[PDB]
Amino acid sequence: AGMFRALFRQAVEDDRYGEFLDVLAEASAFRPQFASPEACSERLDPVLLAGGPTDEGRAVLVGCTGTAANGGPHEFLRLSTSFQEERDFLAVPLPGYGTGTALLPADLDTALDAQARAILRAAGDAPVVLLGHAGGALLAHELAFRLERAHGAPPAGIVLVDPYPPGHQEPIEVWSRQLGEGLFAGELEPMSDARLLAMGRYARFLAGPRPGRSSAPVLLVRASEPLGDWQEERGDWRAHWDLPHTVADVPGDHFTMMRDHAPAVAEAVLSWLDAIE
Amino acid sequence: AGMFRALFRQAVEDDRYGEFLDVLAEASAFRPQFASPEACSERLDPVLLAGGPTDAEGRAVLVGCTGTAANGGPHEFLRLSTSFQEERDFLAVPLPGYGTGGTALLPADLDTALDAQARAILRAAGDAPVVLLGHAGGALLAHELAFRLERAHGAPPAGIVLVDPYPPGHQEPIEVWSRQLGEGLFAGELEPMSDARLLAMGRYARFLAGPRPGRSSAPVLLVRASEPLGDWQEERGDWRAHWDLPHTVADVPGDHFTMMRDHAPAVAEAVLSWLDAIEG
Ligand SMILES: CC[C@H]1OC(=O)[C@H](C)[C@@H](O)[C@@H](C)C[C@@H](C)C(=O)/C=C/[C@H]1C
Ligand SMILES: CC[C@H]1OC(=O)[C@H](C)[C@@H](O)[C@@H](C)C[C@@H](C)C(=O)/C=C/[C@H]1C
Numbered sequence: 331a332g333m334f335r336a337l338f339r340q341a342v343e344d345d346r347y348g349e350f351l352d353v354l355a356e357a358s359a360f361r362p363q364f365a366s367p368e369a370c371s372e373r374l375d376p377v378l379l380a381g382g383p384t385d386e387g388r389a390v391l392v393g394c395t396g397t398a399a400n401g402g403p404h405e406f407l408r409l410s411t412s413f414q415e416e417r418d419f420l421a422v423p424l425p426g427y428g429t430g431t432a433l434l435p436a437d438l439d440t441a442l443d444a445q446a447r448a449i450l451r452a453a454g455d456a457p458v459v460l461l462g463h464a465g466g467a468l469l470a471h472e473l474a475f476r477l478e479r480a481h482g483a484p485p486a487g488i489v490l491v492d493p494y495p496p497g498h499q500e501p502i503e504v505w506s507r508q509l510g511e512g513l514f515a516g517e518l519e520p521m522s523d524a525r526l527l528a529m530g531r532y533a534r535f536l537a538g539p540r541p542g543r544s545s546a547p548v549l550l551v552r553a554s555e556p557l558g559d560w561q562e563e564r565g566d567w568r569a570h571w572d573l574p575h576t577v578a579d580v581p582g583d584h585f586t587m588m589r590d591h592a593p594a595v596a597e598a599v600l601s602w603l604d605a606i607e
Numbered sequence: 608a609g610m611f612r613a614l615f616r617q618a619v620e621d622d623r624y625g626e627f628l629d630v631l632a633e634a635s636a637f638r639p640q641f642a643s644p645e646a647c648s649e650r651l652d653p654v655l656l657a658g659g660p661t662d663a664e665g666r667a668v669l670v671g672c673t674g675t676a677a678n679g680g681p682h683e684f685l686r687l688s689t690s691f692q693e694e695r696d697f698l699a700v701p702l703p704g705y706g707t708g709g710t711a712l713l714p715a716d717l718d719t720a721l722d723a724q725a726r727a728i729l730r731a732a733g734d735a736p737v738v739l740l741g742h743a744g745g746a747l748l749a750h751e752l753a754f755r756l757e758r759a760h761g762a763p764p765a766g767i768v769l770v771d772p773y774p775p776g777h778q779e780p781i782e783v784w785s786r787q788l789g790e791g792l793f794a795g796e797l798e799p800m801s802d803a804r805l806l807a808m809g810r811y812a813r814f815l816a817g818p819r820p821g822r823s824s825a826p827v828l829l830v831r832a833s834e835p836l837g838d839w840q841e842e843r844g845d846w847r848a849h850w851d852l853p854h855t856v857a858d859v860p861g862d863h864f865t866m867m868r869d870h871a872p873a874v875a876e877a878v879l880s881w882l883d884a885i886e887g
């Protein structure tokens with residue numbers, strides 16, 4: 331495949347994921363960009379992956395696609411099956427990953443505004459609950475804040491599946507080799523250099539200073555098994571969010587909670603939606 | 608074809624050449640390397656591009672030190688070398704990291720690459736004194752090689768010809784003309800610059816910007832372009848190439864690029880006169 335993918339493979343092999351991610355972020359600055367939501371080069375139409383029962387005003391779930399360069403429309407497929415007959419589940423694309431390759435957002439807010447527009451159109455009058463996993467969880471919260479601040483529309487809730495926010499990401503840094511190996515393992519096709527640059531650009535966005543906190547209630551879903559080695563004395567390795575409305579612990583690790591154990595995540599979401607409604 | 612080449616093209620358009628070179632250098636860290644001269648994946652056998660008179664011996668041979676340009680290679684000294692035919696042997700030595708046959712390993716550090724060049728040159732030159740010659744980045748490389756030959760190989764060259772060098776204390780013209788320098792790289796493409804070769808160029812650029820000993824005892828011929836490559840506001844000062852304490856300075860027609868492209872005979876003429884002066 332491409333040179334960036336080859337370099338990434340080597341970086342992961344040499345346990346230098348973080349350093350390589352910084353290269354991707356810097357390199358992404360030289361890709362053509364969109365500087366306003368209207369200038370976004372791709373159709374961000376959310377896809378309906380599960381349907382709820384017939385016979386307002388029940389919340390609709392919106393899956394916020396994560397940053398993984400091997401990811402895309404397949405991210406929520408396993409999870410979404412458990413929502414069939416329970417809740418409408420829409421997956422929204424992350425701008426800059428589409429195909430000629432898509433323009434990268436100039437900044438995170440520009441991407442979030444593009445997403446917000448597409449979601450509000452698709453959702454209509456139904457309340458929206460945003461859901462994301464890992465980096466996608468961080469993106470879900472940032473989107474929630476933007477919706478509230480700039481679109482007069484705070485979501486009804488946010489489901490954060492294994493978030494590792496700034497100040498709480500030591501375990502994810504320590505396990506970066508596993509994260510990189512997971513990306514290669516999860517390839518259905520070679521990760522394009524264009525998507526690797528998108529991934530770096532969003533990683534850098536999510537590491538920067540962000541502008542405040544959503545008023546929406548949060549469900550924190552945590553994996554129960556560590557992805558890699560962790561000394562007990564070094565503290566809790568688990569995902570974190572400040573003062574969530576509800577915490578749910580599920581089987582599996584950072585990865586397998588969304589595969590093998592996706593029904594457990596779905597079960598936690600469904601119960602919580604009933605409680606907040 | 609390749610994303611690094613696409614990015615480079617955009618960086619040039621946006622007048623961010625320097626910034627992108629830094630990205631190339633950082634990215635190069637993740638290419639497979641050679642850490643000892645012997646582990647070099649390429650045959651650095653110099654090519655004889657011109658022959659001196661059969662009449663030899665004790666007479667200096669010229670060694671062309673290939674520069675860092677990603678669009679470069681064996682074609683670099685073809686025009687210049689014709690002017691040495693029947694005057695001086697001219698050997699062109701490849702720069703490690705640019706070859707194919709699969710792509711070549713990058714040097715771990717500059718000294719490792721210089722040691723690989725040094726071994727190939729000494730083998731090729733035999734008993735003959737060596738005068739190193741390089742243009743632009745290749746000129747900086749010629750000096751670094753000369754010092755290494757002296758310090759690590761007991762073999763200081765008889766001389767060094769630096770064609771239009773811009774050393775670390777005098778980089779402003781290269782900075783001001785960076786867009787023009789990048790555009791020249793795409794103009795000089797015989798084929799699309801490979802991502803592997805762009806990374807090699809970034810790696811060497813970083814090497815050359817870093818702490819370098821260390822000063823060759825060999826006498827220097829500084830050859831300078833007489834025309835500015837791009838626009839230059841007069842009060843910035845002197846745009847011309849520079850070297851500290853050269854043995855002799857020669858000015859030739861053309862700019863940074865055309866001095867070698869259109870006026871290579873004038874470069875050759877300067878070298879031949881100086882070689883006679885330092886030998887006789
Ligand atoms: C050294 C590995 C990095 O972690 C990531 O790349 C995670 C997986 C990703 O979600 C990215 C999108 C998380 C963001 C916030 C980031 O910059 C992370 C930096 C390191 C913790
Ligand atoms: C923005 C232009 C750059 O200059 C080069 O890349 C020149 C052409 C090259 O010889 C390089 C190999 C010269 C070295 C010293 C370098 O790293 C230069 C960096 C910038 C001044």
Ligand SMILES: [Mg+2]
Binds near residue numbers: 851
């Ligand atoms: Mg001086």
